[PDB]
Amino acid sequence: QIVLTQSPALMSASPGEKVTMTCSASSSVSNMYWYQQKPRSSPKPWIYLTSNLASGVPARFSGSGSGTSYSLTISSMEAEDAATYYCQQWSSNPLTFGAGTKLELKRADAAPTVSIFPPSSEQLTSGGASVVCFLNNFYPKDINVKWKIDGSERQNGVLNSWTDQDSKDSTYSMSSTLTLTKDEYERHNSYTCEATHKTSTSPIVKSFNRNE
Amino acid sequence: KVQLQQSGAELVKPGASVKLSCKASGYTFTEYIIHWVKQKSGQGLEWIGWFYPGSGNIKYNEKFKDKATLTADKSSSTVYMELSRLTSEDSAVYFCARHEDRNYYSYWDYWGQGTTLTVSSAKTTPPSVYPLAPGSMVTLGCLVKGYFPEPVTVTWNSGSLSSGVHTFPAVLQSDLYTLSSSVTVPSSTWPSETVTCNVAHPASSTKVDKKIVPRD
């Protein structure tokens, strides 16, 4: 039943850097068990019996605790280590987990490649208009999208979605959608996708016109 | 080799029941204990109970005492979990896991993938697939809007375009899911050759291929 409290869920670490996660428990516990989980995948056992290291795991990982505060430590961070790590307890009943800490690969900050798309001729024929705007391959994760039509901020009707970190280059990507009526879209002229990122001292703009 | 295989994703109306199955193979069924875990999409893990075949011994997480029933076939080496009186907050991904019977020096060494139960009154809905062409490196994409059951499948040229692809997670615009996918290819590649995104929504068995064409 014991409540398991984990350290900063959003943790950032570059290759080489040493990482430390801690799992705090509400009541005293005999041993702690850690698991790893990848983007929508079955969680695999990582560290069992407080510090034994399960089957599959590199020795750069290490467990410790032996009390009411336990910890998982990576000595040398690597790219294949980005994941969410959970801590489980076996001592009391019922069996409980932590909330999880999502480890993340810190790398050089990259600016996004922005692309905007007018509605397809199919969507208009069925009475509908969706202006998509892709923001591909950037770091860090935090970014804001600002839509503009005829030079004014469209506040509602927006729709954002994020992919997880890329296993190759460790960047993120973002799809922003703007769904309008076929009639409301066939009225304004300029459609701007204004994106703000920490890398640049100005927002990256991609716009188009219906009169094309 | 040890393998645990679970039933496919499900969509049930609130109130009814569902029977999730975990099929073991490659090891003696009556030597390991099967646990069940719930992970509401996004949130963390939660234990529901265990089942030991042979003794037929059960022990539910006492939150899910009235929610779940653990049975087993044993002739097929298969553990069952039934959920009854389903509501909206039962929508989650359910795992099964294996642990040795008399060890203590063991762990949950093998898991059997997820099963994404969806509890909703929404009707099963095929998707609308729209191509997205622009107007040195050329980004394309297609929009998949207005489908419900989940999930969908997006490839480009039957999987002949793998790298440089970004398929984005779905979101509910109103009470239907919308998904977007992108591919980036050299200017020499397109529009001089065909690009066709392939969408498959298995819950409705639709299978759609949309050629990306430049505009007039």
Q: Can you give a write-up of this model?
A:
The complex is a heterodimer of chains A (212) and B (216). Chain A is mostly beta strands and 212 residues long. Chain A has helices spanning 121-125, 182-185; strands at 4-6, 10-13, 19-25, 32-37, 44-47, 61-64, 69-74, 84-89, 101-105, 113-117, 129-138, 144-149, 158-162, 172-180, 190-196, 204-209. Chain A folds into two domains: 4-105, Immunoglobulins (Immunoglobulin-like, Sandwich); 113-209, Immunoglobulins (Immunoglobulin-like, Sandwich), CATH 2.60.40. Chain B folds into two domains: 3-119, Immunoglobulins (Immunoglobulin-like); 128-212, Immunoglobulins (Immunoglobulin-like), CATH 2.60.40. Chain B has no helices and 19 strands. In chain B, strands 2, 4, 5, 6, 9, 10 and 11 form a seven-stranded mixed sheet that branches. In chain B, strands 12, 13, 15, 16 and 17 form a five-stranded antiparallel sheet that branches. Chain B has a four-stranded antiparallel sheet with strand order 1-3-8-7, with no helix packed on it. Chains A and B meet through strand 10, helix 1, strand 11, strand 13 and strand 14 of A and strand 5, strand 12, strand 13 and strand 17 of B.
Provide the descriptors you would attach to this structure in a database record.
heterodimer; A: 212 residues; mainly beta; Immunoglobulin-like; 2 domains; five-stranded mixed sheet; four-stranded antiparallel sheet; elongated; B: 216 residues; five-stranded antiparallel sheet; 0% helix
